[PDB]
Design a protein around this motif. Structure first.
Motif, PDB file in Angstrom:
ATOM      1  N   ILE A 111      -4.168   3.056   6.595  1.00 42.49           N
ATOM      2  CA  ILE A 111      -3.093   2.107   6.513  1.00 42.49           C
ATOM      3  C   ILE A 111      -3.259   1.196   7.712  1.00 42.49           C
ATOM      4  CG2 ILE A 111      -0.605   1.802   6.615  1.00 42.49           C
ATOM      5  CD1 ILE A 111      -1.350   2.943   3.981  1.00 42.49           C
ATOM      6  N   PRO A 112      -3.759  -0.034   7.510  1.00 40.76           N
ATOM      7  CA  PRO A 112      -4.035  -0.920   8.639  1.00 40.76           C
ATOM      8  C   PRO A 112      -2.766  -1.185   9.439  1.00 40.76           C
ATOM      9  CG  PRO A 112      -5.097  -1.707   6.618  1.00 40.76           C
ATOM     10  CD  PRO A 112      -4.172  -0.585   6.218  1.00 40.76           C
ATOM     11  N   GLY A 113      -2.859  -1.177  10.775  1.00 41.55           N
ATOM     12  CA  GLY A 113      -1.722  -1.513  11.631  1.00 41.55           C
ATOM     13  C   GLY A 113      -0.902  -0.291  12.046  1.00 41.55           C
ATOM     14  N   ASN A 155       4.216   0.774   2.225  1.00 43.05           N
ATOM     15  CA  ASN A 155       3.778   0.007   3.384  1.00 43.05           C
ATOM     16  C   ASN A 155       3.679  -1.463   3.009  1.00 43.05           C
ATOM     17  OD1 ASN A 155       2.603   2.190   5.428  1.00 43.05           O
ATOM     18  ND2 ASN A 155       2.019   2.813   3.361  1.00 43.05           N
ATOM     19  N   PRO A 168      -4.514   8.346   7.340  1.00 34.40           N
ATOM     20  CA  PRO A 168      -4.907   7.526   6.189  1.00 34.40           C
ATOM     21  C   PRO A 168      -5.126   6.067   6.589  1.00 34.40           C
ATOM     22  CG  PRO A 168      -2.861   8.790   5.707  1.00 34.40           C
ATOM     23  CD  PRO A 168      -3.251   9.062   7.138  1.00 34.40           C
ATOM     24  N   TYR A 193       4.011  -5.840   9.724  1.00 32.92           N
ATOM     25  CA  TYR A 193       3.933  -4.522   9.111  1.00 32.92           C
ATOM     26  C   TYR A 193       5.259  -3.761   9.236  1.00 32.92           C
ATOM     27  CZ  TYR A 193       2.698   0.427   8.415  1.00 32.92           C
ATOM     28  OH  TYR A 193       2.697   1.758   8.034  1.00 32.92           O
ATOM     29  N   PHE A 248       7.225  -0.045   6.985  1.00 29.43           N
ATOM     30  CA  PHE A 248       7.098   0.951   5.929  1.00 29.43           C
ATOM     31  C   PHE A 248       8.436   1.636   5.711  1.00 29.43           C
ATOM     32  CE2 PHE A 248       6.511   3.718   9.610  1.00 29.43           C
ATOM     33  CZ  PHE A 248       7.192   4.850   9.219  1.00 29.43           C
ATOM     34  N   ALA A 302       5.143   7.009   1.295  1.00 29.95           N
ATOM     35  CA  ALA A 302       5.549   5.838   2.035  1.00 29.95           C
ATOM     36  C   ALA A 302       5.002   4.605   1.343  1.00 29.95           C
ATOM     37  CB  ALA A 302       5.082   5.906   3.487  1.00 29.95           C
ATOM     38  N   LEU A 324       0.864  -1.179   0.000  1.00 32.27           N
ATOM     39  CA  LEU A 324       0.000   0.000   0.000  1.00 32.27           C
ATOM     40  C   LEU A 324       0.897   1.225   0.000  1.00 32.27           C
ATOM     41  CD1 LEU A 324      -2.791  -0.488   2.708  1.00 32.27           C
ATOM     42  CD2 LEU A 324      -2.959  -0.572   0.238  1.00 32.27           C
ATOM     43  N   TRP A 325       0.406   2.313  -0.618  1.00 29.38           N
ATOM     44  CA  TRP A 325       1.090   3.600  -0.569  1.00 29.38           C
ATOM     45  C   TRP A 325       0.276   4.678   0.136  1.00 29.38           C
ATOM     46  CZ3 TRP A 325       5.982   4.683  -2.783  1.00 29.38           C
ATOM     47  CH2 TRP A 325       6.505   3.702  -3.622  1.00 29.38           C
ATOM     48  N   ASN A 326       0.988   5.642   0.748  1.00 30.45           N
ATOM     49  CA  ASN A 326       0.337   6.829   1.303  1.00 30.45           C
ATOM     50  C   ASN A 326       1.257   8.038   1.192  1.00 30.45           C
ATOM     51  OD1 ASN A 326       1.669   5.585   3.931  1.00 30.45           O
ATOM     52  ND2 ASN A 326       1.011   7.604   4.638  1.00 30.45           N
ATOM     53  N   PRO A 330       3.732   6.088   8.736  1.00 28.77           N
ATOM     54  CA  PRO A 330       4.216   6.180   7.366  1.00 28.77           C
ATOM     55  C   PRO A 330       3.874   7.549   6.792  1.00 28.77           C
ATOM     56  CG  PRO A 330       2.178   4.984   7.428  1.00 28.77           C
ATOM     57  CD  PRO A 330       2.633   5.125   8.860  1.00 28.77           C
ATOM     58  N   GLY A 331       4.859   8.135   6.134  1.00 25.56           N
ATOM     59  CA  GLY A 331       4.679   9.296   5.291  1.00 25.56           C
ATOM     60  C   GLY A 331       4.744  10.600   6.072  1.00 25.56           C
ATOM     61  N   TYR A 361       3.152  -5.621   4.169  1.00 28.07           N
ATOM     62  CA  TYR A 361       2.603  -6.604   5.080  1.00 28.07           C
ATOM     63  C   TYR A 361       3.094  -7.988   4.691  1.00 28.07           C
ATOM     64  CZ  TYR A 361      -0.474  -2.641   5.945  1.00 28.07           C
ATOM     65  OH  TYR A 361      -0.981  -1.382   6.191  1.00 28.07           O
TER      66      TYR A 361
END
Ligand SMILES: *[C@@H]1O[C@H](CO[C@@H]2O[C@@H](C)[C@@H](O)[C@@H](O)[C@@H]2O)[C@@H](O[C@@H]2O[C@H](CO)[C@@H](O[C@@H]3O[C@H](CO[C@H]4O[C@H](CO)[C@@H](O)[C@H](O)[C@@H]4O[C@@H]4O[C@H](CO)[C@@H](O[C@@H]5O[C@H](CO)[C@H](O)[C@H](O)[C@H]5O)[C@H](O)[C@H]4NC(C)=O)[C@@H](O)[C@H](O[C@H]4O[C@H](CO)[C@@H](O)[C@H](O)[C@@H]4O)[C@@H]3O)[C@H](O)[C@H]2NC(C)=O)[C@H](O)[C@H]1NC(C)=O
Lengths: 207, 413
Positions: free
Chosen positions: B283-285, A189, B281, A199, A201, A187, A143-145, B264-265, A191
């Motif tokens: 983002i699980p966890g 991410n 956002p 998890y 990132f 970022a 996943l990205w953020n 993250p980010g 899993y």
């Protein structure tokens, strides 16, 4: 009549907010003998919680019938074996299929974010890259953020088998050049069962 | 030495309006909506912005007298102060010039820039600003001098106006050299960024070398505690900062233990503020409920509850507002002290920095008998749960868990 047993999705087993399913799919079911009986065994123990779906005629004039068994996250990750037995009149004998998590020493993913090539700065959109390597088994999610939102304009390659028996993949997030060149943070991410808490990132941003 | 508003409580740095308030809502008008929350922390001053027009490295497109319209109008600022004053929350304006750039103080224009500040000081003091911050002073030539000019201008308008200087310097002598010229100047630093005797030493040595003059206590000029501290030490360090003689300064999210590196980010200096589970956002966890304001509000054991209780103590109890400070020897990794003003309730702070459970081993004889220790003092709170708060503890028998801090109270006697 032929049977295909499918594992749960990585995201479903790794993120404990979601519900992993094993799926037994039977194809080439005739109009004459359309009745299919499914038996499910977890490590040889029969279970009764599976949800069999209504058979669905395909364009080739055969029926496809699906049984779905919900699994426990930890059972899948701990290597329990899921057996689907399919019984049908056209079969000389019941068909038995068994699936589990790949066996073998789990290996922790290494996550490397890579900025766009300078040569890409010619373009209106740039490529933010996430290399994930050295992981086993192949089940993984990415996943990205950015600072405030999910970033959905990405594509991820399937896992590829590397020389050492581990796996790697790349994820590519496409962003407007300006957002990149203005120093905004992204970022990647990841899993995977072999990470702490399943998890990790890594950020990516201009210097 | 008379009481000023910044002696009465914690300062709260909000360096990034959008991070603090949420996506798209990084406006001065939106900060109004958070003043009740801040009031709930009992913070006495917000350090705001900068919010001024800054084009990266453009000394000419830098007008400190004009708000960058992304944050809002000058009306919104006027309306914010009004609402802030009305809730007894003071407003400090960060005027660090090149805040969009990498050298906040530009380059090769040492006098040109300073002028815009000098003019800004006046302009903003007239607008109703309670003080100013300027960071990264080690990247300002003629540091000692320029600060003295701005001090005297700020103090000249009113003794009830504060100037905060921030530096990345952790070196004592460099900090003293800035404070030599201006001793009534609040200086945030990286001085406190380990050993129980060493944090003791640092604190005592600082107070020793500054003649127990008023100072700030912080971990940095901008960064969260989580930049310097592992999670297990956050509660302890909050107890200390809220009980040491001086103004404790935090950044937004310190009250919930906001850790930019775990999210993250997130830029180190401006992570998203976790109001609830919808703030970050999906983002699980990444964010559980117990990492948010909403979650931690519901839990008396939470870091936010602890923050609230300490800020309350610090802003209402004379011994903590302007009490003396007397450190004394304890077990190897213990830092222990008392705060005592006149005949008001005394406070004993016992801090276990080490990761092993320890006997406090308090020795009451090295203390002056003006406020030597009773046999038993009421436990106000522990940083860790399961103690008997509001009931006495026998001081000579104190056993602190790893990383545990205790705040005891006892009356004049
Ligand atoms: C009559 O038609 C049927 C139906 O076929 C469709 O309709 C016909 C009319 C044509 O249009 C076809 O092109 C259509 O597919 C025919 O049935 C087919 O039989 C094939 C065997 O002959 C069989 O092949 C085997 O496929 C396996 C992979 O199947 C995946 O992927 C294919 C696409 O590649 C997809 O079509 C399948 O449905 C299946 O998709 C997966 O389904 C599972 C279960 O739903 C998903 O997992 C679950 O997903 C849910 C969420 O949706 C949830 O997350 C659960 O937790 C999770 O478990 C999974 O995500 C899906 N994957 C994808 C990618 O979407 C191969 O593994 C297998 O390979 C092995 O065998 C080969 C030889 O056969 C070898 O070469 C190989 O090396 C392997 O050993 C097979 O290739 C088809 O799957 C099957 N089609 C369907 C739709 O079931 C029938 O054959 C035909 N009769 C005739 C004319 O004979």
């Amino acid at each position: 009549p032929s049977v295909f047993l499918f594992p749960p999705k990585p995201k479903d087993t790794l993120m404990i907010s979601r519900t992993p399913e094993v799926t037994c799919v039977v194809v080439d079911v005739s109009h004459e003998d359309p009745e299919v009986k499914f038996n499910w065994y977890v490590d040889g123990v029969e279970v009764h919680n599976a949800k069999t779906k209504p058979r669905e005629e395909q364009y080739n004039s055969t029926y496809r019938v699906v049984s779905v068994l919900t699994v426990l996250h930890q059972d899948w990750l701990n290597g329990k074996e899921y057996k689907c037995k399919v019984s049908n009149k056209a079969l000389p004998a019941p068909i038995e299929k068994t699936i589990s998590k790949a066996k073998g020493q789990p290996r922790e993913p290494q996550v490397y974010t890579l900025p766009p090539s300078r040569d890409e700065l010619t373009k209106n959109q740039v490529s933010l890259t996430c290399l994930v390597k050295g992981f086993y088994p192949s089940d993984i999610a990415v996943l990205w953020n950015s600072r405030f939102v999910l970033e959905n304009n990405y594509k991820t390659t399937p896992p590829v088998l590397d020389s050492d028996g581990s796996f790697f993949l790349y994820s590519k997030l496409t962003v407007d050049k300006s957002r990149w060149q203005q120093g905004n943070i992204f970022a990647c991410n990841v899993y995977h069962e072999a990470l702490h808490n399943h998890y990790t990132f890594k950020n990516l941003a201009l210097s | 030495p008379a009481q000023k508003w910044w002696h009465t409580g914690a300062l709260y740095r909000i360096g990034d309006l959008q991070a603090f308030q949420g996506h798209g809502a990084g406006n001065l008008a939106g900060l109004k909506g958070r003043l009740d929350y801040l009031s709930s922390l009992k913070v006495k001053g917000l350090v705001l912005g900068p919010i001024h027009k800054n084009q990266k490295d453009d000394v000419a497109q830098t007008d400190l007298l004009q708000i960058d319209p992304n944050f809002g109008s000058k009306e919104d600022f006027d309306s914010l102060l009004q609402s802030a004053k009305k809730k007894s929350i003071r407003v400090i304006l960060d005027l660090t010039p090149n805040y969009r750039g990498e050298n906040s103080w530009f380059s090769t224009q040492v006098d040109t820039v300073a002028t815009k500040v000098k003019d800004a000081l006046e302009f903003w003091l007239q607008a109703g600003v309670d003080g100013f911050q300027v960071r990264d002073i080690e990247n300002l030539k003629d540091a000692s001098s320029f600060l003295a000019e701005w001090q005297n201008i700020t103090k000249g308008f009113s003794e009830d106006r504060l100037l905060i200087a921030g530096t990345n310097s952790s070196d004592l002598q460099q900090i003293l050299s800035l404070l030599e010229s201006n001793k009534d100047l609040l200086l945030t630093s990286s001085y406190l960024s380990s050993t129980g005797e060493h944090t003791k030493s640092l604190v005592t040595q600082y107070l020793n070398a500054t003649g127990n003059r008023w100072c700030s206590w912080s971990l940095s000029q901008a960064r969260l505690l989580t930049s310097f501290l592992p999670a297990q030490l956050l509660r302890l360090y909050q107890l200390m900062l809220f009980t040491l003689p001086g103004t404790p300064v935090f950044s937004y999210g310190d009250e919930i233990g906001l850790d930019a590196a775990a999210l993250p980010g997130q830029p180190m200096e401006a992570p998203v503020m976790l109001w609830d589970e919808s703030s970050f956002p999906d983002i699980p966890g990444a964010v559980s409920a117990n990492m948010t304001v909403k979650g931690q509000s519901e839990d008396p054991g939470s870091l936010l509850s602890l923050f609230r209780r300490l800020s309350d103590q610090r802003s209402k109890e004379r011994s903590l507002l302007h009490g003396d400070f007397h450190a004394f020897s304890a077990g190897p990794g213990l830092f222990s002290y008392i705060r005592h003003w006149d005949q008001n309730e005394r406070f004993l702070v016992v801090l276990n920095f080490g990761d092993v459970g320890l006997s406090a081993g308090l020795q009451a004889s090295d203390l002056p008998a003006s406020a030597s220790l009773p046999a038993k003092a009421d436990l106000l709170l522990s940083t860790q749960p399961g103690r008997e708060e509001g009931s006495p503890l026998e001081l000579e028998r104190l056993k602190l868990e790893p990383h545990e801090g205790l705040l005891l109270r006892f009356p004049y006697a």
